[PDB]
Amino acid sequence: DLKTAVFNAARDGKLRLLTKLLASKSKEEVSSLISEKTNGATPLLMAARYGHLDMVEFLLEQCSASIEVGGSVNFDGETIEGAPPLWAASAAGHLKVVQSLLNHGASVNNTTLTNSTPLRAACFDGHLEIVKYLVEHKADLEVSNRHGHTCLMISCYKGHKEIAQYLLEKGADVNRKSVKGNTALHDCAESGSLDIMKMLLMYCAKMEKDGYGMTPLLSASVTGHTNIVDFLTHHAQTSKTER
Amino acid sequence: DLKTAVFNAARDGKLRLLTKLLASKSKEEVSSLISEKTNGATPLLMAARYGHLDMVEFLLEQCSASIEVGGSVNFDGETIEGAPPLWAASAAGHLKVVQSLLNHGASVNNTTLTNSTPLRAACFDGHLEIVKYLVEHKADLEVSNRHGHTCLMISCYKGHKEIAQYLLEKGADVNRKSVKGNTALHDCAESGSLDIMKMLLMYCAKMEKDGYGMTPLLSASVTGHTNIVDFLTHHAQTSKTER
Amino acid sequence: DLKTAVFNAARDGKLRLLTKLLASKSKEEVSSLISEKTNGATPLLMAARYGHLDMVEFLLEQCSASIEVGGSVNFDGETIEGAPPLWAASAAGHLKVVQSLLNHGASVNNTTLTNSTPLRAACFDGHLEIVKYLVEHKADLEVSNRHGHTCLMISCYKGHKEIAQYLLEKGADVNRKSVKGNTALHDCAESGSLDIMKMLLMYCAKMEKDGYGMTPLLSASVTGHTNIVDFLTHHAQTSKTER
Amino acid sequence: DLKTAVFNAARDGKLRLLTKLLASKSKEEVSSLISEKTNGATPLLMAARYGHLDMVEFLLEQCSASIEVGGSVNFDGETIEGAPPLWAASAAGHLKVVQSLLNHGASVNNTTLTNSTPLRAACFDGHLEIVKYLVEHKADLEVSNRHGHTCLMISCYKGHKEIAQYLLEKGADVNRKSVKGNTALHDCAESGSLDIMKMLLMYCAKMEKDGYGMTPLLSASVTGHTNIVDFLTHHAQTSKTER
Amino acid sequence: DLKTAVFNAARDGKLRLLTKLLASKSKEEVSSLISEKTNGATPLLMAARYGHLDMVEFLLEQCSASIEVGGSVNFDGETIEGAPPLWAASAAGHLKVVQSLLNHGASVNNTTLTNSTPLRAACFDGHLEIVKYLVEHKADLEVSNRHGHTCLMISCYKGHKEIAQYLLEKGADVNRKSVKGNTALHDCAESGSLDIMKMLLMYCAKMEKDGYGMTPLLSASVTGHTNIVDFLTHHAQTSKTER
Amino acid sequence: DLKTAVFNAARDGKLRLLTKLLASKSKEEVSSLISEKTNGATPLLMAARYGHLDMVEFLLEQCSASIEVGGSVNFDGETIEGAPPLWAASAAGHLKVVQSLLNHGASVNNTTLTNSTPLRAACFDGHLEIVKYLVEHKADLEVSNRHGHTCLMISCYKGHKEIAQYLLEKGADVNRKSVKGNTALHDCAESGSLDIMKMLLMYCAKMEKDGYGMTPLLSASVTGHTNIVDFLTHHAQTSKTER
């Protein structure tokens, strides 16, 4: 029951209570209690996921053994397995927690079980400051998830212009193809992100067919993004005005 | 430094020397000393990697929280980072150490920093008993490393017939693709593993082009495995013998 | 003309008229008049094509030689060559005659010159009871015509929901591709049969480009069936929601 | 057994023994004993299969109804089902028997159960004089077997340059694709038949990838026919010599 | 400047004023003045561009070498560079001026700086008589501009039915592709020229994807030309009306 | 005829003779004689094609009217139509003639009838000094010939390492695809230019399938360039050594 009481105090950031529950315990005892999993998650992972900074700081100062341990977290109603504290904090948008974990020696490229990096985690809900902090702390831009979907691809798919712009400047590969032949240009077409598509084209992104035989023009047509259909048809027909 | 002497004793399995070193130290000092990193590795990770079963039992009985700490390990010249003790024992083929770590509550799916599981670690050098033990102790067959290379793929590539057979019978997905579009059929073609290929086709593994535009037939042709080519051309031309 | 008089009675199902025409003829003379062809077709073929059970029984009891002899039959003003009696009776919906020919040892996989089986014949105009009888009497589900259009693909095109369901239950391969590259899902997409499409995918159907480089999604997009379009774009993008 | 004795004499071409075995009985009993099937084949089919001309013409006089009746025949350790006497004679290379069966009113396009025409049967082993005679007596050049493999395709695969030339001259479709997407250009490539390939290209032949994503050049490369490989690499690169 | 006064007079076709200007000047002085460039163009190019037939005759009678000199011309706001007189007269639709220049020995295939022929120039605005005169005066139908766009292509794009009809009858290649993979069928589909498309298919024009991954059917679908879509879908689906 | 005598003197560079042949003629007369074509070529074109510098200088000082006129020239036994003097000088490697033509106002991007630029002309036989001179005089690197084959593509195909290196530094588009889908990487593979392939990859060139389904690996395999096969198979399989 003490392990459960410790986990419950850590998950809800009740630092006063946790201090009292660990009051006269040894290093071995505290480390064991703080590194155990409850319902597939460690106290640190939960403190990090819900952004309890003081709680994160306390647990890391007691023991850092669980800093790389991936566990069960929930986002958009779905369970994500093997997510380490840095990924969860990055995905949930807790910048000070991201900074605390990195200051305590967290691995910037340590992924979930599906090979999603903390940088990819921050790009999904568009946490620009976290993206910059991670890139500044040697996050690899080319580590894609198991689908071969990159940080640049997901930023375009979600229409995060500022993040896509930053990734491009930092040297993100515009012509990377996912497992199914998807490129960042297709992500733009599907989200109707005309300004990001223009950026990619400025960084020499090429129009390509994906595994489904779809080019970005066709992806825009089937998703009803007429802004991108108009732009690409005009781009294709402009040289026909030449006598 | 005493911390260094403790590390060497754990690494070289000198259980008699270590106890003389941790003689006048309290459980608090012992716990702190056997949890400290030297050369980017803990004493437990080194004891696990070189299969000192008595040493593993001793270190775990002093500090239980060290069980998931990932660190630097050396395999075939290369230095692998963030490897937990269970991964290292699985990769070096120490079955008793694997059984011991799992009995002590080690996370069966805790990966290296490149998302390699103990199950994948064991599949590389072909440690069949460790493969079956991890699988029966709920190892995820579908967690792939950073390149999207699965346990089934590496088993097929190294020509481990018995391991590939066991993974298929336990329900490993034959149609998984790596980030570069590699399938288990390509691993067979590149290693001339015709027996394993026939097994994959019994599980209806589909012939697909990889990211280099190569189907398993073309991969076998450019790598000189005429045994695979002769089979696949013969099988694709078997209808032409028929009247 | 005696040969013409025999052919006309058999086609019209005039058993009493035929009995009088053969009354003063020897067994060998009867077999010659019943195996001869008038306008590319035999008397047994016309009796099968126009569902005359009594007539078919009489002809087979006299001479069985014509059981697998293919000939010319008309359907929608189109003349189909080399169609044997079992195919003609299946195509025209004569369950009584189908059963009789099988009882008299007709070949269940015997095709027209275009490699159309009696199973594909019944699937076209949707004769469910005939489909069931043929499948129960060892008819091959996967023998496609000269275009590689299978029994499942044609059932989906005409909108026969009950026949498509029976075929899928009996293990029809929905991942099959035609000579052009058509899959069962294009026919659904071209009619706007979402319910039938959903049924094909319930049995895990494969998306493939046809001989026009068209997938079911694109087929639906150009035929104006937006309900299919909306459905397949959402399905294609599902892996992009993964964090 | 009398039924066996009659079948055996017909297969062995023993005319004297057969007419003595049927000398008594009656015409009705002879027509009944000569129409019965033994081991899935009629006496007439075995007579035509092993090319016993005098035996075939005798059995055609006793009964002219068995001429279109198909059965079981053996060729290079395999059984072909529902093969009519004309098919077996063309396949085994019995020109004079083919000439007699057609003179006695045999269906020139009557196929096996796998939709193999006698024209395709002669094309396999390369009976040029039979190919000519069958085409001369209106054999449909476009009737392909169940796999969709045409007469031209099998002539190219078996290296019969003379038969392939004749079929081209008579108007065979070079662009025809099988159920597996195979064309004659591929068959040329799979055989090493450069001279037939040159002929196809003299009539402007189109290079297309099959259902294995293989072009004739790739097909020739994996089957080790470097003569065709060298020819098609040079041909593919011709526009690169343009200044 | 007299050079400027001579230029304006030739441009405006003021033949009366020009002779008063070239009054006391020797044939050597006239030759040098009439060949000089103003605003990047010669007096003859300007006389040809604005169809002053009397002026053209006069300037050519003074200097013959000027007939091929290319210069700057204005068309629909845009400034075309290196246009010879024959190109400008063709584009502006001045038939008598085109006829006069060819009677004076002008090069029928001399192009602008973007490789546009007088034949292509005449095709753009649809000057049928100039198209027929140039073709009958040995104009090369297959010289395409810098984008690989042919006379047939622009004719198809601008909807010039009679011009496209004449080009096909004179043997223009229907299967030419531009640098961006555009074919004449795509020009038809983009302009809704269904009459011209039907014409191209009579010449066996092949349906191909362009550089944007579009077939003529998909190009028509995204540009809203339902007439083309309804035709091509109905044509690809007409076999499926057959019972 | 004097015109033929003038052409012959100009073609063979006999300046002393040409000076004596034109000795008393007027500007109009000289201009007419040196601007006329003999056997499809002008005196200037022939002087430029065979590198008669003094002759080029003399003809240009008399009249420059023919500086952009394309004519008939022969290279590698083949006739090239509509080649202007600058293209011919660039193709034949006459650097001083190239400089003279540009000094006299020649258009650096004026092409042959097949859209081949003087820059593309210099890249074929590898005239590095001419390539550098043209690029320094605003030659467009991206103007491809009618096949969509670029300056970079032809430099790689011909194994001109120094030229490919220079073009890459000047911003040549590495990922440009020809009409048939050819990329500069395929040109390297077919010529076995392993050093140039490494350079292209360093400049972010991507491995792609051409219209024939060939990737650079396959193109290298069919042309027997095992050095490139070895490099690309090692490149593809290196991540498989990772535990």
| Interchain pair E120, A218: CB under 8 A | no
F38 phi, psi to nearest 5 deg: -125, 120
- Beta-carbon contacts of F77 under 8 Å, excluding residues fewer than 6 positions away, are none
Q: How many Cβ pairs within 8 Å bridge chains D and F? A: 44
Four-residue CA torsion sign, F104, F107, F108, F111: negative
Interface test with A, best of E214, E223, E225, E229 (most A CBs within 10 A): E214
Percent helix, percent strand, percent coil in chain B, to nearest 5 = 55, 5, 40
Gap between the Cα atoms of A215 and A224, Å rounded:
14
Residue C162 vs residues C131, C142, C195: alpha-carbon distances, Å: 11, 18, 11
Gap between the Cα atoms of C30 and A125, Å rounded:
85
Gap between the Cα atoms of A124 and E39, Å rounded:
57
Residue B52 vs residues B10, B13, B76, B128, E125: alpha-carbon distances, Å: 8, 6, 20, 20, 88
Gap between the Cα atoms of D108 and D130, Å rounded:
12
Residues of A in contact with E75 (CB under 8 A): 243
CB burial readout E198-237, b (16+ within 10 A) else e: ebbbeeebebbbbbbbbbbbbbbbbbebeebbebbbeebe
| Interchain pair A242, E114: CB under 8 A | yes
Residues of D in contact with C177 (CB under 8 A): 211
D55, D13 contact by CB (below 8 A): yes
> Both ends of chain F: CA-CA distance in Å?
84
Gap between the Cα atoms of C144 and C181, Å rounded:
13
Residues 45-64 of A with CB under 8 A from C: none
Residue C5 distance to chain E (closest CA, Å): 29
Q: With touching defined as 3+ CB pairs under 8 A, do chains D and A touch?
A: no
Four-residue CA torsion sign, E201, E203, E208, E210: negative
Residue F93 distance to chain B (closest CA, Å): 39
F181, F211 contact by CB (below 8 A): yes
Query: Which ranges of A158-237 does DSSP label H, i.e. alpha helix?
Result: 161-169, 184-191, 194-202, 216-222, 226-237
Gap between the Cα atoms of E105 and E176, Å rounded:
30
| Interchain pair D144, C68: CB under 8 A | no
β-strand B71-75 against A78-83: which pairing, if any?
unpaired
The structure tokens listed for C141 are 């589900």
Neighbours of A169 (CB within 10 A): 10
Q: Domain coordinates of chain C in residue numbers?
A: 1-243
Host H or E run for residue A5: helix A2-11
Four-residue CA torsion sign, C91, C97, C100, C105: negative
Residues of A in contact with F204 (CB under 8 A): 173, 175
D73 phi, psi to nearest 5 deg: -140, 145
The structure tokens listed for B204 are 């209806």
Gap between the Cα atoms of A180 and A211, Å rounded:
5
**DSSP one-letter code for A74:** E
CB burial readout C190-225, b (16+ within 10 A) else e: bbbbbebbebbbebebebbbbbbbbbbbbbbbbbeb
Helix (H, G, I), strand (E, B) or coil at D144: coil
- Beta-carbon contacts of D208 under 8 Å, excluding residues fewer than 6 positions away, are D177, D181, D183, D215
**Amino acid code (one letter) for C117:** T
DSSP per residue, F3-24: HHHHHHHHHTT-HHHHHHHHTT
DSSP per residue, D162-231: HHHHHHHHTT--TT---TT---HHHHHHHHT-HHHHHHHHHT-PPP---TTS--HHHHHHHTT-HHHHHH
Residues 197-226 of B with CB under 8 A from D: 207, 209, 215, 217-218, 221
Gap between the Cα atoms of C113 and A70, Å rounded:
63
Give the Cα-Cα-Cα angle F56, F57, F58 (nearest 5 degrees). 90
A80 at interface of C, judged by CB pairs closer than 8 A:
yes
A239 at interface of E, judged by CB pairs closer than 8 A:
yes
| Interchain pair A217, E221: CB under 8 A | no
What chain A residue is nearest to B208 in terms of C-alpha separation? A211
Q: With touching defined as 3+ CB pairs under 8 A, do chains E and A touch?
A: yes
- Beta-carbon contacts of F34 under 8 Å, excluding residues fewer than 6 positions away, are E65, F6, F10, F42, F43, F44, F59, F62, F63, F66
What chain A residue is nearest to E144 in terms of C-alpha separation? A243
Which method was it determined by? X-ray
β-strand C78-83 against D71-74: which pairing, if any?
unpaired
E35, E42 contact by CB (below 8 A): yes
β-strand E71-75 against E78-83: which pairing, if any?
antiparallel
Gap between the Cα atoms of C83 and C226, Å rounded:
39
Residues of C in contact with E215 (CB under 8 A): 212-213
A180, A211 contact by CB (below 8 A): yes
Gap between the Cα atoms of A53 and A93, Å rounded:
12
D89, D80 contact by CB (below 8 A): no
Gap between the Cα atoms of C122 and E75, Å rounded:
65
Q: With touching defined as 3+ CB pairs under 8 A, do chains C and D touch?
A: yes
The structure tokens listed for A181 are 């032949």
Interface test with E, best of C123, C222, C225 (most E CBs within 10 A): C222
Residue F41 distance to chain E (closest CA, Å): 12
Using CB atoms within 10 Å of the CB of residue A136, give its burial: 0 to 12 exposed, 13 to 18 middle, 19+ buried: exposed
What chain A residue is nearest to B140 in terms of C-alpha separation? A113
F178, F149 contact by CB (below 8 A): yes
Residues of E in contact with F35 (CB under 8 A): 64-65, 68
Tally of residues, chain A = 243
C72, C39 contact by CB (below 8 A): yes
Which of D221, D232, D239 is nearest residue F147 as measured by Cβ atoms?
D239
Q: How many Cβ pairs within 8 Å bridge chains C and D? A: 63
F194, D193 contact by CB (below 8 A): no
DSSP E strands in A11-165: the ranges are 71-75, 78-83
Query: Which ranges of B62-193 does DSSP label H, i.e. alpha helix?
Result: 85-91, 95-103, 118-125, 128-136, 151-158, 161-169, 184-191
| Interchain pair A240, E114: CB under 8 A | no
**Chain centroid, CA F168 distance in Å:** 17
Helix (H, G, I), strand (E, B) or coil at C48: helix
Four-residue CA torsion sign, C113, C115, C120, C124: negative
Residues preceding gaps in chain A (C to N > 2.5 Å): none
D1 at interface of B, judged by CB pairs closer than 8 A:
no
| Interchain pair B144, A69: CB under 8 A | no
B239 at interface of D, judged by CB pairs closer than 8 A:
yes
The structure tokens listed for A170 are 């930092």
Residue D62 vs residues C28, C100, D31, D97: alpha-carbon distances, Å: 9, 29, 6, 17
Residues of E in contact with F181 (CB under 8 A): none
| Interchain pair F218, B221: CB under 8 A | no
Residue B16 distance to chain F (closest CA, Å): 33
Q: With touching defined as 3+ CB pairs under 8 A, do chains E and B touch?
A: no
E186, E220 contact by CB (below 8 A): no
Closest CA to B152 of B205, B112, B107, B115: B205
Gap between the Cα atoms of E205 and E184, Å rounded:
8
Residue F243 distance to chain B (closest CA, Å): 6
**Amino acid code (one letter) for E25:** K
- Beta-carbon contacts of A150 under 8 Å, excluding residues fewer than 6 positions away, are A120, A141, A142, A144, A172, A173, A176, A178, A184
D116 at interface of B, judged by CB pairs closer than 8 A:
yes
The structure tokens listed for D162 are 């003379």
Residue C172 vs residues B148, B175, B207, D178: alpha-carbon distances, Å: 32, 20, 20, 21
Tell me the helices (H) and strands (E) count for chain F, helix number first: 15, 2
| Interchain pair C113, D110: CB under 8 A | no
Host H or E run for residue C154: helix C151-158
**Amino acid code (one letter) for A192:** G
Gap between the Cα atoms of D135 and D151, Å rounded:
11
The structure tokens listed for B154 are 């590496």
Closest CA to F32 of E231, B53, E64: E64
Neighbours of D151 (CB within 10 A): 32
The structure tokens listed for E24 are 């006391």
Closest CA to E193 of E220, E174, E173, E169: E220
* CA dihedral of residues B47, B48, B54, B55 (deg, nearest 10): 30
Query: Which ranges of B174-215 does DSSP label H, i.e. alpha helix?
Result: 184-191, 194-202
Give residue E29's region: left, alpha or beta (phi > 0; psi -120 to 50). Answer: alpha
The partner residues of B73 in beta bridges, in order of sequence, read B80
